[PDB]
PDB file of N, CA and C in Angstrom:
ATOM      1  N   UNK F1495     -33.021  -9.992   9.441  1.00 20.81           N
ATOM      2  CA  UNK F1495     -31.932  -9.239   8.830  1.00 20.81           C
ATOM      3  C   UNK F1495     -30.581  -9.551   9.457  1.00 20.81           C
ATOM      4  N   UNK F1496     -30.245  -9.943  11.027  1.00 17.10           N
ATOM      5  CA  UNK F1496     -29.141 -10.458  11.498  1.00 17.10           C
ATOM      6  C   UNK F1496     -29.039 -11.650  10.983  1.00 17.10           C
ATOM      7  N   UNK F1497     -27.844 -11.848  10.448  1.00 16.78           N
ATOM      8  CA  UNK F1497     -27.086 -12.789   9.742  1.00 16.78           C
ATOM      9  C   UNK F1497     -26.785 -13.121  10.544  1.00 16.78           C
ATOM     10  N   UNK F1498     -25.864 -14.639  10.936  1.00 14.71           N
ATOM     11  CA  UNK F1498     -25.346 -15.238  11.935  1.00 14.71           C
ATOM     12  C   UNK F1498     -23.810 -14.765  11.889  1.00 14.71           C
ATOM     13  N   UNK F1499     -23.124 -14.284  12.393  1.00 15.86           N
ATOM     14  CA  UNK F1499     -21.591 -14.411  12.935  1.00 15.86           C
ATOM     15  C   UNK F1499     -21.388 -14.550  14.155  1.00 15.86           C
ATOM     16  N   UNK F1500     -19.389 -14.770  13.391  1.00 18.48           N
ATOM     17  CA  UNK F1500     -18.923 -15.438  14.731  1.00 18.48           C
ATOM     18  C   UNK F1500     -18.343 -14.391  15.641  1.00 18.48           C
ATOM     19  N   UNK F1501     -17.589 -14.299  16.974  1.00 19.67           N
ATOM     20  CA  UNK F1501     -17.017 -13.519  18.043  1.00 19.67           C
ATOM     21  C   UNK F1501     -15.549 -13.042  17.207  1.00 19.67           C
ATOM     22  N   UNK F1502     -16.077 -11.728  16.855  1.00 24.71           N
ATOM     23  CA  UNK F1502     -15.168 -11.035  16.024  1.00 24.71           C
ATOM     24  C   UNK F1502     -14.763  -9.137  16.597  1.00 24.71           C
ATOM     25  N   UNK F1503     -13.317  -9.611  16.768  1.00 30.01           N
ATOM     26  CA  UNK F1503     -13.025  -8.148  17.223  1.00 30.01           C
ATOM     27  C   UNK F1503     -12.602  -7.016  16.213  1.00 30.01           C
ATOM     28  N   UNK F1504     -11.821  -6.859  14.957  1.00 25.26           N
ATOM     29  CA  UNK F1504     -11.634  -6.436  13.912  1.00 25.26           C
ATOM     30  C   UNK F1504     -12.771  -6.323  13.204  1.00 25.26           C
ATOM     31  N   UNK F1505     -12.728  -5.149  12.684  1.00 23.76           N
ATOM     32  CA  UNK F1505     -13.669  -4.667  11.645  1.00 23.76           C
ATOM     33  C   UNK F1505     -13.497  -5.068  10.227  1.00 23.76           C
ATOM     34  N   UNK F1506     -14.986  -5.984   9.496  1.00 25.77           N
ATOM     35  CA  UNK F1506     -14.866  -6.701   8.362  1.00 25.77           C
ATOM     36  C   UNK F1506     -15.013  -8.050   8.486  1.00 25.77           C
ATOM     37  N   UNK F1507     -15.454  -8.840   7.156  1.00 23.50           N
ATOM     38  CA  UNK F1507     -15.832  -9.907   7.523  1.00 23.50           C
ATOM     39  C   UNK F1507     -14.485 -10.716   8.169  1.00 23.50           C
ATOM     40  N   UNK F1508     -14.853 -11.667   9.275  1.00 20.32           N
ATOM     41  CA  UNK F1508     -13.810 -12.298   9.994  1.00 20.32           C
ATOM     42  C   UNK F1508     -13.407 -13.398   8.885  1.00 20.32           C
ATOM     43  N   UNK F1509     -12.487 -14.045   9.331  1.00 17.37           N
ATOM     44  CA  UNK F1509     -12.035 -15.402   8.448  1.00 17.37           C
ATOM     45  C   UNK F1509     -12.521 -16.757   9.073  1.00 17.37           C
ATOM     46  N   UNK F1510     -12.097 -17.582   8.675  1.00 19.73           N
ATOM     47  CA  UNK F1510     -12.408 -18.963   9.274  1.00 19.73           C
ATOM     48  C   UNK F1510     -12.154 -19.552  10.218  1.00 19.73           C
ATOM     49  N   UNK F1511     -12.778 -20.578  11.085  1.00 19.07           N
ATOM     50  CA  UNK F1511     -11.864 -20.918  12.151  1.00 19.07           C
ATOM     51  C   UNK F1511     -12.524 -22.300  12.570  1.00 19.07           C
ATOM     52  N   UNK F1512     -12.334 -23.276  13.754  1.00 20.64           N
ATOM     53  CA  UNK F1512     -12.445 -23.728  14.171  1.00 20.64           C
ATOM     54  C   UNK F1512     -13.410 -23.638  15.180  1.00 20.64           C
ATOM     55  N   UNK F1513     -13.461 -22.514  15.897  1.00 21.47           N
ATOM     56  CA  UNK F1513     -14.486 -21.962  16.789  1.00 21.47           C
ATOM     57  C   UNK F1513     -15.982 -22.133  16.644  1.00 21.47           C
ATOM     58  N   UNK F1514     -16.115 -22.247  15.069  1.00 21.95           N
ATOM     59  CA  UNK F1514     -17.739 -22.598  15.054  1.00 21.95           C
ATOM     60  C   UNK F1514     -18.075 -23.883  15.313  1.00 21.95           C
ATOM     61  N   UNK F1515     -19.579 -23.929  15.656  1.00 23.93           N
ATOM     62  CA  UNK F1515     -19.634 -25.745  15.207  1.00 23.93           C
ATOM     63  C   UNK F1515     -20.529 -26.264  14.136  1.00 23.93           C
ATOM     64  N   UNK F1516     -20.923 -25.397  13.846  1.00 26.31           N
ATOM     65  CA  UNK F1516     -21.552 -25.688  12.049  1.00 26.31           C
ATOM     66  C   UNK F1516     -21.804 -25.149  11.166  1.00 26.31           C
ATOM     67  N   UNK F1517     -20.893 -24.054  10.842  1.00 27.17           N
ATOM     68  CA  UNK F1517     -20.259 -23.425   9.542  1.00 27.17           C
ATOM     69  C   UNK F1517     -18.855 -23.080   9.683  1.00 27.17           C
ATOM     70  N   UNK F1518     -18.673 -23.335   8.560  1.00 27.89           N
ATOM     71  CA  UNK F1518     -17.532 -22.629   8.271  1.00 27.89           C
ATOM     72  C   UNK F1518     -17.466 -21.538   7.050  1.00 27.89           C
ATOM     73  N   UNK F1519     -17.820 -20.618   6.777  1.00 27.93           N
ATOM     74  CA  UNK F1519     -17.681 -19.972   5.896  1.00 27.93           C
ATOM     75  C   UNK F1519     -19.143 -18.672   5.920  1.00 27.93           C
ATOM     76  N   UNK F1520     -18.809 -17.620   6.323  1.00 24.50           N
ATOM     77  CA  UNK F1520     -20.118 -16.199   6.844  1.00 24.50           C
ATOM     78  C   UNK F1520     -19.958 -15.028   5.384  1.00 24.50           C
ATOM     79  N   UNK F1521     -21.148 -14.961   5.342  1.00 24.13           N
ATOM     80  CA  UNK F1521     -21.136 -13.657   4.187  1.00 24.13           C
ATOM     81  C   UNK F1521     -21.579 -12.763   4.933  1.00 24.13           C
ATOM     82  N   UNK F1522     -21.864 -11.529   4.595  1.00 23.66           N
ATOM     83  CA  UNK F1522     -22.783 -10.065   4.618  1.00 23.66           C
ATOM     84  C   UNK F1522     -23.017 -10.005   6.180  1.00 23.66           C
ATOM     85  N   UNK F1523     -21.495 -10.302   6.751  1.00 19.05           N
ATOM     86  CA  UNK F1523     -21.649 -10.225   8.312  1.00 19.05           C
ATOM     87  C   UNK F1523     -22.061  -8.422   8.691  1.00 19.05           C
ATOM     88  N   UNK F1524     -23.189  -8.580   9.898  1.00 19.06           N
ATOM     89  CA  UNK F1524     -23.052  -7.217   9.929  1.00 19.06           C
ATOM     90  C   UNK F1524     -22.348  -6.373  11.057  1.00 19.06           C
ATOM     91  N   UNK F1525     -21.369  -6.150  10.453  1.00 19.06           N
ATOM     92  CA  UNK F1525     -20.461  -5.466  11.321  1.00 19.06           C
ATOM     93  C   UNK F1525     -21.010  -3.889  11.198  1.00 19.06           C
ATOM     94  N   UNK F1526     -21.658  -3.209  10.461  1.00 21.22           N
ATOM     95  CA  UNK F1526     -21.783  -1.741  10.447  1.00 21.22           C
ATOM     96  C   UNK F1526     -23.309  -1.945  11.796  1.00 21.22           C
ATOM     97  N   UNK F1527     -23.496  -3.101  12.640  1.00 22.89           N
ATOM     98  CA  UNK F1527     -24.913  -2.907  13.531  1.00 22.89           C
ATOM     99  C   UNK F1527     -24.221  -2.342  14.920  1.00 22.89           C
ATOM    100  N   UNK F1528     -24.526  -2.261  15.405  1.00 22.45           N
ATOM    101  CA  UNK F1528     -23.819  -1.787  17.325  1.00 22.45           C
ATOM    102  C   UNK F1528     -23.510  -2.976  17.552  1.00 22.45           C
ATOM    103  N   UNK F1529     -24.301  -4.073  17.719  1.00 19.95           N
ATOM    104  CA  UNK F1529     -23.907  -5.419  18.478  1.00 19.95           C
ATOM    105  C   UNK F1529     -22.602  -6.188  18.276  1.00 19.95           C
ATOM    106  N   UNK F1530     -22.014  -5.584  17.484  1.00 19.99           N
ATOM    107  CA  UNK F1530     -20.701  -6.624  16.770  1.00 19.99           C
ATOM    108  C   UNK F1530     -19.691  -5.818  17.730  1.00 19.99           C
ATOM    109  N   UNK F1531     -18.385  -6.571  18.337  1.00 21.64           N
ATOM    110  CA  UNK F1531     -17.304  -5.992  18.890  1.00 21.64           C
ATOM    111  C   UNK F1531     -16.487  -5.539  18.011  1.00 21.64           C
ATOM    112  N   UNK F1532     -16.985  -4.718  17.257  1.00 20.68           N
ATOM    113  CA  UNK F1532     -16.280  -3.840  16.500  1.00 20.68           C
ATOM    114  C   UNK F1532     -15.883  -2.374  17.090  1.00 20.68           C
ATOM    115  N   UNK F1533     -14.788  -1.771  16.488  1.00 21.89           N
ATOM    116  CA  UNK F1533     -14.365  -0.235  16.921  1.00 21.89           C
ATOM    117  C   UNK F1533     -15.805   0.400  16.497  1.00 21.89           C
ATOM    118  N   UNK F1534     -15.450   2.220  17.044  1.00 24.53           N
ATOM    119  CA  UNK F1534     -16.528   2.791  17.198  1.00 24.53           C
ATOM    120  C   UNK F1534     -16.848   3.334  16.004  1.00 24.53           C
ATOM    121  N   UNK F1535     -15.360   3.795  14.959  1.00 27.42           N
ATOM    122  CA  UNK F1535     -16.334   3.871  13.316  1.00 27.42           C
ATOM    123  C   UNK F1535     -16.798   2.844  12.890  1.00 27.42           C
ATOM    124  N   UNK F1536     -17.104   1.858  13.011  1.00 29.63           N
ATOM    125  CA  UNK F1536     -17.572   0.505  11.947  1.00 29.63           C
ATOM    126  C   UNK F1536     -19.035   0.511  12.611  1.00 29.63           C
ATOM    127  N   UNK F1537     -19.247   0.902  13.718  1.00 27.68           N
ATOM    128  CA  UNK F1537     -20.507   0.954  13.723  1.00 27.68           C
ATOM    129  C   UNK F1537     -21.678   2.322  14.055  1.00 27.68           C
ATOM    130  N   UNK F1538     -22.344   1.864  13.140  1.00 23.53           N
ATOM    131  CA  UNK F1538     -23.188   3.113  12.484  1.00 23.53           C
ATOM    132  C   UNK F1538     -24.696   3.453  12.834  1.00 23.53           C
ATOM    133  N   UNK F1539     -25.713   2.159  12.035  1.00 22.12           N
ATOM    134  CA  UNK F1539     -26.432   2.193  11.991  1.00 22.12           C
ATOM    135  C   UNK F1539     -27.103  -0.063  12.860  1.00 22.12           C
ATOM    136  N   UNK F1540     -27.988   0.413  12.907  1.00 21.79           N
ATOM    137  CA  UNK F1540     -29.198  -0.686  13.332  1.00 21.79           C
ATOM    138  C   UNK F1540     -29.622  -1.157  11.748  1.00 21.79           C
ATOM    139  N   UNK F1541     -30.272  -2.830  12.180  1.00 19.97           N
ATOM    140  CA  UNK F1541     -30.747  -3.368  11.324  1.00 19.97           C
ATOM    141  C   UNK F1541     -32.397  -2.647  11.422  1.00 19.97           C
ATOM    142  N   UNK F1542     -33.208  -3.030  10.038  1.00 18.30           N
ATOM    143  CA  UNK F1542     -34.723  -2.308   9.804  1.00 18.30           C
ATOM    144  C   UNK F1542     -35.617  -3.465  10.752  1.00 18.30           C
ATOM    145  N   UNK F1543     -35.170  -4.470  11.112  1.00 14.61           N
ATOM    146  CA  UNK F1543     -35.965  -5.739  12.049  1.00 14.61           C
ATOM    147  C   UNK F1543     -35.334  -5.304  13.254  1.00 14.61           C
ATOM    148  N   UNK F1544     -33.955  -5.075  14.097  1.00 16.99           N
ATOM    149  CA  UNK F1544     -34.127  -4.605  14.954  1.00 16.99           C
ATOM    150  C   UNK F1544     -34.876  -2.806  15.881  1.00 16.99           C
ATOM    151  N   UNK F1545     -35.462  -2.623  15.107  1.00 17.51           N
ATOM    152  CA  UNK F1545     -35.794  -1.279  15.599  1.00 17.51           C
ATOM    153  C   UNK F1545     -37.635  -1.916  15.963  1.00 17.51           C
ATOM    154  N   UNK F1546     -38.048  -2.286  15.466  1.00 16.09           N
ATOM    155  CA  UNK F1546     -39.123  -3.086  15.932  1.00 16.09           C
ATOM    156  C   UNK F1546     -39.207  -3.499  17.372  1.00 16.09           C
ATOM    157  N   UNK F1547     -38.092  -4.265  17.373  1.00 14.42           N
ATOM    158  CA  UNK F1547     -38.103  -4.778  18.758  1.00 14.42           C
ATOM    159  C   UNK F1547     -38.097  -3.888  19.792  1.00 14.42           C
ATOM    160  N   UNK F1548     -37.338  -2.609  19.663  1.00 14.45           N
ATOM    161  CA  UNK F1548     -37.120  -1.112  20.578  1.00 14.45           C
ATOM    162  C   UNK F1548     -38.642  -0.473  20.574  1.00 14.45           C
TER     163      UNK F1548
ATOM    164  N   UNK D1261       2.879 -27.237   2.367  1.00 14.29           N
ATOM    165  CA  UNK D1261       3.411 -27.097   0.838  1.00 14.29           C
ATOM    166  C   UNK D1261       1.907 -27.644   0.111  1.00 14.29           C
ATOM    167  N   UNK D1262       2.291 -27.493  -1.328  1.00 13.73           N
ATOM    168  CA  UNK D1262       0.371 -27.208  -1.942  1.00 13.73           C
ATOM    169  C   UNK D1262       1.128 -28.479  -2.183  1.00 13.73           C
ATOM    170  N   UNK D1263       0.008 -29.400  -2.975  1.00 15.52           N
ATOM    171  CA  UNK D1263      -0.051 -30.441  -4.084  1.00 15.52           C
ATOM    172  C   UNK D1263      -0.628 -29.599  -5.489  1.00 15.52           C
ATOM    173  N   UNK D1264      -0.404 -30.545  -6.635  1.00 12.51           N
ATOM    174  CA  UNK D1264      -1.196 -30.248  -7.991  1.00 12.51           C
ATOM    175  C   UNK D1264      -2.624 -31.029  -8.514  1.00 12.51           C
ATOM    176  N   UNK D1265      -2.618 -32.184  -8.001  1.00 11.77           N
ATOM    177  CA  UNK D1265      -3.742 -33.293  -8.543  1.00 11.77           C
ATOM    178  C   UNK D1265      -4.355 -33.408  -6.869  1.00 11.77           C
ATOM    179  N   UNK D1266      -5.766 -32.947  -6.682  1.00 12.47           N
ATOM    180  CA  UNK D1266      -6.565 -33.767  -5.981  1.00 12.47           C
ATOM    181  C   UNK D1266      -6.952 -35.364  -5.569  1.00 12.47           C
ATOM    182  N   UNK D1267      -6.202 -35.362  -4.645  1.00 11.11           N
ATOM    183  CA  UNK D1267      -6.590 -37.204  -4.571  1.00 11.11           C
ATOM    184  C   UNK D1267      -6.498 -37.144  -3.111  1.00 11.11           C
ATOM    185  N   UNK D1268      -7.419 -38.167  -2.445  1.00 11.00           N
ATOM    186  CA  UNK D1268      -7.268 -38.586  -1.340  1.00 11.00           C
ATOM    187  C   UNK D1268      -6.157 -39.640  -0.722  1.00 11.00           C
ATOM    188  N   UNK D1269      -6.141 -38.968   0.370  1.00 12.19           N
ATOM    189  CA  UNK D1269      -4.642 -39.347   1.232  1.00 12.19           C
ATOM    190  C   UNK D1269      -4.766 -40.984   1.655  1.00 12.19           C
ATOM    191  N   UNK D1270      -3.692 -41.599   1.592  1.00 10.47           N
ATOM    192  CA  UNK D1270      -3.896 -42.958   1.702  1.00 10.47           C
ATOM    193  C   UNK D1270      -2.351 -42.987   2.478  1.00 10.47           C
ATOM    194  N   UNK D1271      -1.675 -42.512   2.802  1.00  9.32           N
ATOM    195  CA  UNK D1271      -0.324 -42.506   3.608  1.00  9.32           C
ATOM    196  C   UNK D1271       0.612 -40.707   3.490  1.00  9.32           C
ATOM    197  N   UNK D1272       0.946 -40.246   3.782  1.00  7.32           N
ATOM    198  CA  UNK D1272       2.093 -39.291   4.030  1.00  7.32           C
ATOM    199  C   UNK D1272       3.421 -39.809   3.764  1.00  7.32           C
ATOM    200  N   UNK D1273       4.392 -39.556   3.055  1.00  6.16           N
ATOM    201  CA  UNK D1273       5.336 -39.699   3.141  1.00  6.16           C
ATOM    202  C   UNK D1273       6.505 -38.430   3.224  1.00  6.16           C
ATOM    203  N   UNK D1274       7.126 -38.042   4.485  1.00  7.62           N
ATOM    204  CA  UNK D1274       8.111 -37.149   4.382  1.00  7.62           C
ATOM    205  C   UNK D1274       9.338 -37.604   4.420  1.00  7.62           C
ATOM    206  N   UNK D1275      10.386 -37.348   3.325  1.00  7.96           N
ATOM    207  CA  UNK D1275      11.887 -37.611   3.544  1.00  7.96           C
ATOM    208  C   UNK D1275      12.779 -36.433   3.939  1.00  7.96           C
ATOM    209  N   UNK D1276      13.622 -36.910   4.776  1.00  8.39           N
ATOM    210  CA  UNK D1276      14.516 -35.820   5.818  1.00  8.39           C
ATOM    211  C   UNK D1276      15.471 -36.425   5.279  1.00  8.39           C
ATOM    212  N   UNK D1277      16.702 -35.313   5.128  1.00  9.79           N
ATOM    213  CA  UNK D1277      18.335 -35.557   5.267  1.00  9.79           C
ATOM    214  C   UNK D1277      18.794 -35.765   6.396  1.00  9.79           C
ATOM    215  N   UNK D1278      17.710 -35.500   7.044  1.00  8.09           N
ATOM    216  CA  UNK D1278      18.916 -35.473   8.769  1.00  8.09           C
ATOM    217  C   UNK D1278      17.654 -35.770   9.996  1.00  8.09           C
ATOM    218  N   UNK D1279      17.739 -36.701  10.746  1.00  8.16           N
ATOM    219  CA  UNK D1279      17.253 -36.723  12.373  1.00  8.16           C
ATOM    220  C   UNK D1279      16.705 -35.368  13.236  1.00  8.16           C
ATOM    221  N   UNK D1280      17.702 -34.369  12.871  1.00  8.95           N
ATOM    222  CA  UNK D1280      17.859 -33.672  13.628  1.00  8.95           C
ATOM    223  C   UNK D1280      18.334 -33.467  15.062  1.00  8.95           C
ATOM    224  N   UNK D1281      19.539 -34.839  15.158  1.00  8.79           N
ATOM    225  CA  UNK D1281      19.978 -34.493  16.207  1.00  8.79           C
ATOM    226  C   UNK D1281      21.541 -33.795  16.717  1.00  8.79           C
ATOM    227  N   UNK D1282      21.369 -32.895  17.580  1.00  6.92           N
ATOM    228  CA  UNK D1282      22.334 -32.135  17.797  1.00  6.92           C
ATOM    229  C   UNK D1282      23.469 -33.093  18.300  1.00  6.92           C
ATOM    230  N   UNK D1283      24.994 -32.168  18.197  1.00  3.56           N
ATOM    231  CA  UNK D1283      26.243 -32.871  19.032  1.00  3.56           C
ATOM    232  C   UNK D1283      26.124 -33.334  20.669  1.00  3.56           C
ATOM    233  N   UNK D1284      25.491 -31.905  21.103  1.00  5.10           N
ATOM    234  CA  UNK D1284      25.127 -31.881  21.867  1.00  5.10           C
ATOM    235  C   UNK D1284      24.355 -32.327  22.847  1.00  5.10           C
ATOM    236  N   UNK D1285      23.270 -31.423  21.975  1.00  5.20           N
ATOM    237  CA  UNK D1285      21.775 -32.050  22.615  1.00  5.20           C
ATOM    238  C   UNK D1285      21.724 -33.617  22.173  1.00  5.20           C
ATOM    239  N   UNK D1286      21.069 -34.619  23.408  1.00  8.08           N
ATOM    240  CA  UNK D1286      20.926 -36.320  22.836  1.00  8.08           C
ATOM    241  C   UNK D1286      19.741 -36.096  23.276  1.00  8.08           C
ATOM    242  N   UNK D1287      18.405 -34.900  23.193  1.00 11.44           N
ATOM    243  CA  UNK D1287      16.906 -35.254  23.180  1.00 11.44           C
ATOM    244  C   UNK D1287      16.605 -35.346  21.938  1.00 11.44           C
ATOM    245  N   UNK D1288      15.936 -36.027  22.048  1.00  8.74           N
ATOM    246  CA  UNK D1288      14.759 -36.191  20.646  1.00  8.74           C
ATOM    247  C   UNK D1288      13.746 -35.112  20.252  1.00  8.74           C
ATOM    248  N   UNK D1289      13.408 -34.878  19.502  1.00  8.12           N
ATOM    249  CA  UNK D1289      12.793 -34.015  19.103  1.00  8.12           C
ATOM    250  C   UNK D1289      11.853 -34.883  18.186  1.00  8.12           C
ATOM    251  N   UNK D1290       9.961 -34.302  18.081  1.00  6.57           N
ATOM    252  CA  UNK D1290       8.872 -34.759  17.652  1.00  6.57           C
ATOM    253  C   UNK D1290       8.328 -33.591  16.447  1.00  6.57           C
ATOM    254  N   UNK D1291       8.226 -34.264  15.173  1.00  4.56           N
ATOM    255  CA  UNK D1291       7.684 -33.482  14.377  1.00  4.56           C
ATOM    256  C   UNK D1291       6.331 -34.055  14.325  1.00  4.56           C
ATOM    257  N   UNK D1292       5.304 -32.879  13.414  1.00  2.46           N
ATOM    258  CA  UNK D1292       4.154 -33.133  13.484  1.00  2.46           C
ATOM    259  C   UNK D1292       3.686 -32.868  11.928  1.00  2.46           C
ATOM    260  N   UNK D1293       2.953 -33.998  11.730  1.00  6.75           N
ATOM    261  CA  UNK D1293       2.866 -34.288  10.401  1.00  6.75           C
ATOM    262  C   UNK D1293       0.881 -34.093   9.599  1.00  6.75           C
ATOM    263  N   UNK D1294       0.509 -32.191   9.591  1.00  9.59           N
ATOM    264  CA  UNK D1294      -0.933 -32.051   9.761  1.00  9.59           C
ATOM    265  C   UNK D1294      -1.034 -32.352   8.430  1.00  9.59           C
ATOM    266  N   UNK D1295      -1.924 -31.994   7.912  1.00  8.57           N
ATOM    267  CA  UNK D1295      -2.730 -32.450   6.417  1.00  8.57           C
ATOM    268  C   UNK D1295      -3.792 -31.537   6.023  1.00  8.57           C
ATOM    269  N   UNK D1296      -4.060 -30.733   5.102  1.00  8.81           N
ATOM    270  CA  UNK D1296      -5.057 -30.078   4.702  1.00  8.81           C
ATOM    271  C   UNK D1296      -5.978 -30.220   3.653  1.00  8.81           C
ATOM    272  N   UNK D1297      -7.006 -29.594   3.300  1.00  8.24           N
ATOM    273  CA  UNK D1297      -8.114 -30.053   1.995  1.00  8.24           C
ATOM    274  C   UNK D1297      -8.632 -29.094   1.611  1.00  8.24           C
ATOM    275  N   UNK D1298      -9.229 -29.262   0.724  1.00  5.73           N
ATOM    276  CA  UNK D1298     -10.088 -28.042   0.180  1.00  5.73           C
ATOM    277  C   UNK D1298     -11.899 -27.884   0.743  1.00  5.73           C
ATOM    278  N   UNK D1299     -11.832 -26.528   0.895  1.00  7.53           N
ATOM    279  CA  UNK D1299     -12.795 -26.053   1.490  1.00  7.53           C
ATOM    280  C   UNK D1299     -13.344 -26.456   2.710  1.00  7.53           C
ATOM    281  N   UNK D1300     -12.647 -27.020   3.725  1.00  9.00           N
ATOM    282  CA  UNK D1300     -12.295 -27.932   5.319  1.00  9.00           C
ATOM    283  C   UNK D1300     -11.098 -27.071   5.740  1.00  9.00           C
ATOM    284  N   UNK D1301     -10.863 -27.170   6.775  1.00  8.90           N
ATOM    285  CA  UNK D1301      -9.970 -26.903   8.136  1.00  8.90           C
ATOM    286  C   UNK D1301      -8.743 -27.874   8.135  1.00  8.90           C
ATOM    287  N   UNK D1302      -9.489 -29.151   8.360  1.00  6.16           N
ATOM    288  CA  UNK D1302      -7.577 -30.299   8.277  1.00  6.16           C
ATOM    289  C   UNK D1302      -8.447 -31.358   8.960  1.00  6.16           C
ATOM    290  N   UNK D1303      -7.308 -32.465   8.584  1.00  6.50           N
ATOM    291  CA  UNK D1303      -7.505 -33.746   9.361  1.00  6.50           C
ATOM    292  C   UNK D1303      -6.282 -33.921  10.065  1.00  6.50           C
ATOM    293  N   UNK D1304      -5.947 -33.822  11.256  1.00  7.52           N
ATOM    294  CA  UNK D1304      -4.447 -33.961  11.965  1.00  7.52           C
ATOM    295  C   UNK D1304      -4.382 -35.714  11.870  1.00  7.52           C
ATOM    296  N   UNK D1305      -3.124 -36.172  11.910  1.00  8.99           N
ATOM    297  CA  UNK D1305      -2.798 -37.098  12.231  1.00  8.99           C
ATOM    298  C   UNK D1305      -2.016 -38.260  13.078  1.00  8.99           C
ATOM    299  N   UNK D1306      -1.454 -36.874  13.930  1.00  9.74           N
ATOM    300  CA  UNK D1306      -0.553 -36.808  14.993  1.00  9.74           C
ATOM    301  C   UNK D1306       0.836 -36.271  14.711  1.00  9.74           C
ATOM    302  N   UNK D1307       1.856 -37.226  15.909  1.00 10.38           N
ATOM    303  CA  UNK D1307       2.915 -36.600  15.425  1.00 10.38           C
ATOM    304  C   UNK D1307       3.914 -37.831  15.702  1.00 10.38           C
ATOM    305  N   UNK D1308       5.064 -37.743  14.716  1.00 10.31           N
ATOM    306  CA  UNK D1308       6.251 -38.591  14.918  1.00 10.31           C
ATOM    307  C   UNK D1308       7.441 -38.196  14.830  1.00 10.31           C
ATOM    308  N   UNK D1309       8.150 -39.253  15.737  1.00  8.82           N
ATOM    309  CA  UNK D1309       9.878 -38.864  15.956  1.00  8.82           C
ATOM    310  C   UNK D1309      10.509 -39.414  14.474  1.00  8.82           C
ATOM    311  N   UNK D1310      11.976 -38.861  14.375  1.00  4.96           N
ATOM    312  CA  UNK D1310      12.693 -38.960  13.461  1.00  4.96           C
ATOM    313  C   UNK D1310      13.556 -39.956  13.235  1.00  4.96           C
ATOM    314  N   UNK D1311      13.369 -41.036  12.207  1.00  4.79           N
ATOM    315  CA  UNK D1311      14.615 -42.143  12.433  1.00  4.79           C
ATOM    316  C   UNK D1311      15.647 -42.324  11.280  1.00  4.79           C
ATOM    317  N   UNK D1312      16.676 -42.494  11.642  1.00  7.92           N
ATOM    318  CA  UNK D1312      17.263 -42.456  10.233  1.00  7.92           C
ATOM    319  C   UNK D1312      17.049 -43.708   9.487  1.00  7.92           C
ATOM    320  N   UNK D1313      16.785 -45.021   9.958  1.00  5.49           N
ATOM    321  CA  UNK D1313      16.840 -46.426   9.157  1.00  5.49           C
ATOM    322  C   UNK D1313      15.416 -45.718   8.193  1.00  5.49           C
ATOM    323  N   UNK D1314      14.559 -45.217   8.975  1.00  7.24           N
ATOM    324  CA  UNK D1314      13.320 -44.750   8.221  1.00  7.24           C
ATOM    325  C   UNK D1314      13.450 -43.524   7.343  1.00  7.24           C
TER     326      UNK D1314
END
């Protein structure tokens, strides 16, 4: 269920950059999981594959 | 600045009215001449000084 993104501080999908090294372009980033450096409303809830692992 | 017709780059050409050099100032100054594409980042190509014969 974790999608791959990149090192993103703003909440929402990030934009493009240079920083990756083999994509350029992320959908259905999940910023609403804890793990993303997002502020503290954007994150909410856990993915249904990470709770397994807990 | 955009283009209208897709075609691959085979030279750059920029025309200047002016050097850009001051009364004053006798440094040179280096412009930089990047390049962009669709759905890619860029191909840089470096950078060059200003001549007027050119």
């Amino acid at each position: 269920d974790t999608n791959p993104a990149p090192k993103h501080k703003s909440c929402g999908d990030p934009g493009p950059g240079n920083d990756t090294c083999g994509f350029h372009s992320f959908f259905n980033t999940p910023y609403n999981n804890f793990m993303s450096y997002a502020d503290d409303d954007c994150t909410d809830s856990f993915t249904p594959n990470q709770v397994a692992r807990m | 600045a955009y283009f209208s017709q897709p075609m691959v780059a085979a030279a750059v050409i920029v025309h200047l009215v002016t050097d850009g050099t001051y009364y004053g100032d006798q440094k040179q100054e280096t412009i930089s001449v990047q390049l962009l594409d669709t759905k890619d980042q860029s191909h840089d190509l470096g950078l060059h000084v200003l001549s007027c014969r050119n």
